[PDB]
From a paper:
The SPZ’s main surface antigen, the circumsporozoite protein (CSP), plays a pivotal role in SPZ biology and constitutes the immunodominant target for host antibodies. PfCSP contains an intrinsically disordered N-terminal domain (PfCSPN), a flexible linker region composed of NANP and NVDP repeats (PfCSPrep) and is flanked by N- and C-terminal junctions (PfCSPNTJ and PfCSPCTJ, respectively) and a globular C-terminal domain (PfCSPC) adopting a so-called αTSR fold that is connected to the SPZ plasma membrane via a GPI anchor. In this paper, we describe the functional characterization of 12 camelid single-domain antibodies (sdAbs, also known as nanobodies) targeting PfCSPC. sdAbs correspond to the variable domain (VHH) of heavy-chain only Abs (HCAbs) found in camelids (llamas, alpacas, camels, and dromedaries). A structural characterization of the sdAb-PfCSPC complexes through macromolecular X-ray crystallography (MX) and/or AlphaFold-Multimer shows that most sdAbs target the non-protective α-epitope.
Diffraction quality crystals were obtained for PfCSPC–sdAb1 and PfCSPC–sdAb9 complexes, and data were collected to ∼2.1 Å. The crystal structures reveal that sdAb1 and 9 target the PfCSPCα-epitope. This epitope is composed of the Region III residues (adopting an α-helical structure), the flexible loop between the two antiparallel β-strands of the TSR fold (referred to as the CSP-flap), and the hydrophobic pocket between the α-helix and the CSP-flap. The paratopes of sdAb1 and 9 are largely similar, which is expected, as they belong to the same VHH family. Noteworthy ‘interaction hot spots’ are sdAb1 amino acids L101 and F103 that are inserted into the hydrophobic pocket delineated by PfCSP residues L320, L327, L358, Y360, and I364. Three other important interactions are the salt bridges formed at either side of the α-epitope between sdAb1 R105 and PfCSP E357 (left side, only for sdAb1–PfCSPC) and sdAb D99/D113 and PfCSP K317 (right side, both complexes), which likely stabilize the hydrophobic interaction center. For the sdAb1–PfCSPC complex, the experimentally determined crystal structure further validates results recently obtained through a combination of molecular modeling and mass spectrometry. We note that the predictions were highly accurate, displaying an almost perfect overlap with the experimentally determined crystal structures (Cα RMSDs of 0.99 and 1.08 Å for sdAb1–PfCSPC and sdAb9–PfCSPC, respectively). Indeed, fluorescence imaging of fixed PfCSP–PbSPZs shows that sdAb1 more readily interacts with MG SPZs compared to SG SPZs, independent of their maturation state.
Author numbering:
A (entry chain B): 311 to 375
B (entry chain A): 1 to 125
Amino acid sequence: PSDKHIKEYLNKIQNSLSTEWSPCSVTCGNGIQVRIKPGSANKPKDELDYANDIEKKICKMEKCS
Amino acid sequence: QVQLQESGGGLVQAGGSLRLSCAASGRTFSSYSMGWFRLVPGKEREFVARISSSGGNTYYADSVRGRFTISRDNAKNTVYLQMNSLKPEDTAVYYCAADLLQFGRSSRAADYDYWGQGTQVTVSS
């Protein structure tokens, strides 16, 4: 997933960010999963640093048909 | 793909003030968080300030806190950096940068998506 894909997904769930892993951003192909890092728990939305506070991992789904 | 262009650099006496501006082409400026960075030769680009896409939240490096102000006019597709009480240590090429992330903090140059071409700012004692 591109930087644009990751950030546009964060913008969409921006008021739903929590320490819980999000679902995959896509149902097919490669997407991202995001969460607030446990060390950053309870940091309000507007204090979250993109690099330091938001954990991001790739989620691979089945190819798109 | 949005084009960013700075204006306002130049020579200024220590203790003086300067207003830099940065204009975005097209019709996407309002969807970006905007940032300013500065390049001293021999170091990485240093974060100066950031403003969310709405303009409701701003963030500063401690080296300019209390002296610089970042603001935006979404009607003009322009972001601004007002610099007061300038010091010789403020001498640098200043760059605007656009971030697709519309909220939160971001202080690393690598995590911004579009860049202007830089305007030199020189502060003599």
